[PDB]
Write a protein that binds this DNA or RNA. Structure first.
Length: 108
DNA sequence: GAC
């Protein structure tokens, strides 16, 4: 399992994809995940939510026509989800936020 | 796009 900021940032930079322990919300939902129940670790052991589109509506991240942003959970082990997310663009800019997309730091 |  790889779910730390540096670990995921390195993997993303090297392989241009999230490591195997990530599943999208749709995939998680298909497995029986119910947000209000905080049951992810029970329906998908050792998995973290990741890979969904981040719309960047606040414009806090660098924007450019045709650039798509995606986000993935970081530091998730169990229970309800946290505030830690890695943000990555189609052109491989990588950012982190620890406050649920309120502020971001460039890390790769 | 924690819920």
């Amino acid at each position: 399992v790889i779910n730390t900021f540096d670990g995921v940032a390195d993997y993303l930079q090297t392989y241009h994809k999230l490591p195997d322990n990530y599943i999208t919300k749709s995939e998680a939902q298909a497995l029986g995940w119910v947000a209000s129940k905080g049951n992810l670790a029970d329906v998908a052991p050792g998995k973290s939510i990741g890979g969904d589109i981040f719309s960047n509506r606040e414009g806090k991240l660098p924007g450019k026509s045709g650039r798509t942003w995606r986000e993935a959970d970081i530091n998730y082990t169990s229970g309800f989800r946290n505030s830690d997310r890695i943000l990555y663009s189609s052109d491989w800019l990588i950012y982190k936020t620890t406050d649920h997309y309120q502020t971001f730091t460039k890390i790769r």
